Specification:
The structure is cut from a larger assembly and holds four copies of chain A.
Chain A (H helix, E strand, L loop, with lengths): L1 E3 L6 H11 L6 H8 L7 E6 L2 E15 L3 E13 L8 H16 L3 E5 L12 E2 L2 E8 L18 E3 L5 H12 L10 H9 L12 E5 L2 E7 L6 E9 L2 H12 L6 E6 L5 H4 L6 E8 L1 E5 L2 H7 L9 E7 L3 E8 L2 E6 L6 E3 L1 H8 L5 H6 L3 E2 L3 H11 L12
Parallel strand pairs in A: 4-5, 11-12, 15-18
Antiparallel strand pairs in A: 1-2, 2-3, 3-4, 5-14, 6-14, 7-12, 7-13, 8-9, 9-10, 10-11, 15-16, 16-17, 18-19
The complex binds the ligand CCN(CC)CCSc1nnc2c3cc(F)ccc3n(C)c2n1 (4 copies).
PDB class: transferase/transferase inhibitor
Keywords: Acetyltransferase, Aminoglycoside resistance, Competitive inhibitor, transferase, transferase-transferase inhibitor complex
Entry title: Crystal structure of Eis from Mycobacterium tuberculosis in complex with inhibitor SGT416
């Protein structure tokens, strides 16, 4: 049981473990595309005696954080232990080696999507963004008198494949402007438009709604032909967001439109009946591990409505820092002064993009302090002006 | 078709319309208890030719708003139009007469629970609190190392009826301290403990978990004998909240615990796996209509982390005001100066308890302003330190 | 946290814990009937500081084992830990005290029904009888030419309550003759005929099919009015068993008859289409803990078709014995000779009534031996001529 | 309406009737592979006026029976009557002609899988093996301290297609050793690995778990992506059986593992909680018709624990025999002595592999005798040491 970087001969074995481990695995050509996003020495495999029984890698990603700041981010993915080698500490060993490499490469943060919610908190990952599924009963949906775009429509119904360039440009603007935003490279746009084709005995053809400042990708569900699934909706202005929803509610053959969006999606407020946009499903999105506390805390913007304050943050087994926050900027310096706020590294990941209130984590004792005032100040300071969203699964 | 205050002879006809209109109606003795909360001239009926075909009333309630301030509140309830008299404007007429009486009596706000979400926005009511149903799969539920109370338990399993006094005192402390809090009078405690008994071919016996600083009322579901429904959980400290959840997760015969709680419930953060507390259901709770804008805005506390700022708020058909917010206090005076922020009265109701961000309503154009800075300032100012909750249905 | 025998004042607290712990709990009058079957010092309670947070008791039962031998049996029941006192070792402590008392009273075996299947093996209990639910689609059911009773019917349709004496006598004959048989006292016949009445918004009226040598109790399901549930069918001869099934298949208004029976129920072989009697559900019934290995092994009959053989059985932490089995009788004496067969005490409980083959437990390594021949000999010796059945839940 | 052997021109018509009659029919190339297992004059067709409206054939099979004895077996299959020619006695006529040919060729037994359970008993076929579906909730599954293989795993995760030779050799060992075992020829291994590929809009890719002494083939279900279906698990030792189940329980992405196995599968006993392996489904497997009673009875081994005994067996319309069973061997000679045991030919098929107890068939009067002692002796004699299993559907 050796742990090392895969050579070219190891990848066929990794694709086998992938096929066996991941129900969403497409195949080798698809996996070879994703592979272009893995840097030299971004992958570890565990071999036995030699077949691959363990793998983990990170991709080079660019994550937008509050203040429209873009951080280089280690995107953890393709993590699998062979079912024949469970409870053998192959995960702990592989995660430890990737975190060593990520830390030493100068990534301030690492991110992942969790297949399960009870395995990543112990490695320093906290849930940082929230997914909401909204299901609209569009037969009762009337737009409010106040809703924008209520002449002729600026939204066009188009073949996704013929307007790639327009989607790329709209997404590029979106991701630079929104916390949770990720740069989407060429190979992930190749994959998105591939998954947009009708598969024989699979998914149905996908259509696009195209606005100068927004797009929605949607398809009719395989089995329920009265449900339209919005796979992606990216709007840069409120005009674009409302116009795309007028078009989607205009799908008169459908009973229901479903979308995975965020808790602050304004759609419910566009309707005379907020309740018609039901929350069916709610889950953690992106998980963040802060690799370097001072680098991360200093890199993001803070609320400019919070008055300058100072405190001492202890991260368990992650350092103690004098934290000065003033006019949306933070300075974070080593100190041995008595801590005023204590928290595990994962709790910091959860606060970092403004998705979770410090008051809430405090109420669960994930975040300790004997000062209510400091709690309110952290809450306000760490809050994000632009609501935090999830870019894409990796 | 006359509109007037009911005499004693009208109530049997009102109970008939109630039985026909409300599936949760219990009977005349129950209705006569609720009736003790209706003031002289708090009820209107529409008679035809004379049977009752229309009714509406308000109860005298005490609503806690941010800053632990208690407002007298007109609680709208028992609103019904006979199915034989629909689309005859009996609602508009009855609501108009009650709002006249509520306004002239000096209630700063009115509140209701909506049977439907598309009928109260036009009368100036905005959704002000959010209900979340959490369902825990308690077979996988492990408390975090950081979770309080992890000697001997301070929680007791008791018959609800034998510890009324302890529940009353705990609730009384809870309601004075939490936005959305309502004073619960004697007759509503009589009703709560009545609905806690096993009904022949109805609900099962209810049990209580009693802590010095919290209680939970729970029962096993009628049909699914592996599901425990928490009807009420009121905790005054984080210790009480966690201890009651250790006890509920200790119901080893159950697969699932379900509760109606709020979006900021810390329970998910008490567990090693946040995902085990799934959000199954999400809906508007209390709806608020601001009867007097200056009285309401001046009565609540504001975030003390927001720096003093001034603006002009126009409420559509509800006045224009110079709004000065400073050190958690507001002054609100008539002005004819140009408005900087415009919104319908219902949008103000939605902001009033801090459940909805001004940024979100702005993104839907329910709230108009050409100043991003003022938007962030309203967001921070109107936010509530203590998370907003729903007391009880009326 | 004291462990002691309950006084008269403790029982109200025990009934409270019962109501909270058991969804099948009826009430105090019912519990007080069952209580008549608990001997002096048959109950333990754990008090805190004083409310009951723990209880366990055994009832005095008479269990028929192979060879039509009746053993005094400690029937463990009414076992509950308050949800506020989990993971505090109250079960281990209570079970240890009852086993001390059971052992010292001279019970050779103890029995229970398990609410869950993963908590009793560690206390020496093994699953000893198997329940099968058969569901017959009676619309296709034709009896075989070979099936008995195919003049006039000897089966009568009767009110259960008017023929108590006939049911008692038939059951008394059944239980003396069948492994798994339990003596049913007067108070359990009072309970059976009570649960046979229609409950307002509960179960429907129960009817009896009465043969000189058998009865079936049945009722129509609460919700599915095309399903008849056979609550109990006790037949002393094959004639009685077939006649009662001709009558049940004669319920022409029903689509389905369901019964909880045993794996060797001959019903499938009474039909031209064995498949029409589908096995819907299968579970452990009675669990046995052997309190005294030599007393238990010497008390039961063995297959007379197995030729005299000798071996050494080691029960883990339960003694080592020279085991001589010959002409359906066993002698079991202390030895220090090398063991030829090793097994935990629970594995012995599972073998004791002939429901599980030694070969099967061997294949799972629950039962160790380096002799295939001895395995076949144990299999044949421990097999029961009369198939093993479950009497009633306690 | 003529009955004869098909010429080469009849097969296209037979494939048409197959496609119309069998939902599991794949196509002509697949059918042409199976056809290689049909001997010269193993097929009958009924032509009308000339399209095929009737067909039946047998394949040459090798069935392992108790005592590890391999019998040549007529495997009845591809039996269909056109829906236009029902109730015309085409089945009775075709079955009669194949049984003539099977008898005259010197097959001691014939076997089939029944599409329905009420049509083959009248032709002398009795259900001889039992299928159990086990569904494991693998999230709660913990192996017992006693379970084998609890260093490094000897189980490998492999592509089925790359380890054909290893599966063939393991199966060949399995089938020679187990009652119900069938030789699987090359063309049935071609079919098994063909059905193991992912079909576009069909089944998902199949994976193998490979041990030196066992394999499991498994795939994720089409629709329920949290369920793994074990299509085949063949273990030669208990070590192999437990190791393959440690691997399957190691599929951490799945909630449920389902397998079609036998009533004596030791899996439930490998777990701390036997109940986690639920029996969801139970059905007849292989059906046996004894073509030659003396040849069949003399060919199988009997329990060596049963003391030499003699009796007279009458098979209805199938002969009367002096049956002497001693030291696991039987002699079966014509007699006209008074019968002591009577049964239809199908009842003998059901007893032949030890799946059904003579006591059980006696209790249903499918098997007549006025001697309890002889019944116990038949039970013990006919019982199989190695538990009876089902090889593959034909
Ligand atoms: C997470 C969203 N899924 C679509 C439903 C992903 C498609 S399946 C797939 N295949 N190879 C890879 C892969 C290969 C690498 F070398 C690195 C990362 C990869 N990811 C995320 C992969 N995902
Ligand atoms: C809203 C919560 N329900 C319990 C499920 C209420 C119980 S049914 C009922 N009956 N009379 C009244 C009544 C009579 C009045 F005069 C005034 C208000 C009333 N409410 C809310 C009532 N509700
Ligand atoms: C197990 C079958 N159930 C019927 C569905 C039982 C009815 S509820 C009940 N109540 N008190 C008792 C009780 C009281 C005792 F003191 C001792 C044993 C008891 N059991 C089994 C009890 N069961
Ligand atoms: C019973 C298991 N099924 C797989 C699900 C079988 C695959 S479909 C099929 N096609 N042709 C034949 C066939 C052709 C012959 F000439 C003889 C036997 C055959 N069987 C069983 C066949 N089965």
């Amino acid at each position: 049981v050796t742990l090392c970087s895969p050579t070219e001969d190891d990848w066929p074995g990794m694709f086998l473990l992938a096929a066996a481990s991941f129900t969403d695995f497409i195949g080798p050509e698809s996996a070879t595309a994703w592979r272009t996003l893995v840097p030299t020495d971004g992958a570890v495999v565990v071999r036995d005696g030699s077949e691959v029984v363990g793998m983990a890698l990170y991709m080079d990603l660019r994550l937008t954080v509050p203040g429209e700041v873009v951080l280089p981010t280690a995107g953890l993915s393709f993590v699998a232990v062979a079912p024949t080698h469970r409870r053998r500490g192959l995960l702990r060993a592989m995660c430890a080696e990737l975190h060593r490499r990520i830390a030493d490469s100068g990534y301030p943060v690492a991110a992942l999507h969790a297949s399960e919610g009870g395995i990543y908190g112990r490695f320093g990952y906290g849930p940082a963004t929230t997914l909401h599924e909204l299901t609209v009963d569009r037969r009762f949906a009337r737009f409010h008198a106040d809703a924008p775009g209520g002449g002729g429509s600026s939204v066009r119904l188009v073949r996704p494949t013929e307007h790639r360039g327009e989607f790329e440009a709209i997404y590029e603007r979106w991701r630079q402007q929104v916390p949770g935003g990720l740069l989407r490279p060429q190979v992930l746009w190749d994959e998105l438009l591939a998954e947009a084709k009708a598969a024989p005995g699979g998914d149905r053809e996908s259509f696009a709604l195209l606005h100068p400042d927004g797009y929605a990708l949607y398809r009719v569900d395989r089995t329920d032909l009265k449900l339209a699934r919005v796979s992606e909706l990216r709007a840069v202005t409120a005009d674009a967001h409302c116009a795309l929803w007028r078009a989607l509610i205009g799908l008169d053959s459908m009973e229901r439109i479903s979308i995975i969006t965020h808790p602050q999606d304004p759609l419910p407020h566009l309707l005379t009946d907020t309740r018609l946009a039901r929350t069916t499903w709610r889950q953690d999105g992106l998980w963040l591990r802060i690799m370097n506390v001072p680098a991360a805390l200093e890199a993001r913007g803070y609320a400019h409505e919070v008055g300058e304050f100072s405190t001492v943050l202890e991260v368990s087994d992650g350092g103690r820092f004098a934290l000065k926050i003033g006019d949306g900027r933070a300075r974070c310096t080593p100190t041995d002064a008595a801590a005023e706020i204590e928290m595990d590294r994962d709790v910091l990941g959860s606060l970092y993009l403004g998705a979770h209130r410090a008051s809430t984590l405090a109420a669960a004792n994930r975040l300790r302090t004997k000062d209510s005032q400091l709690l309110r100040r952290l809450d306000a300071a760490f809050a994000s002006d632009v609501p935090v969203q999830t870019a894409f699964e990796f």
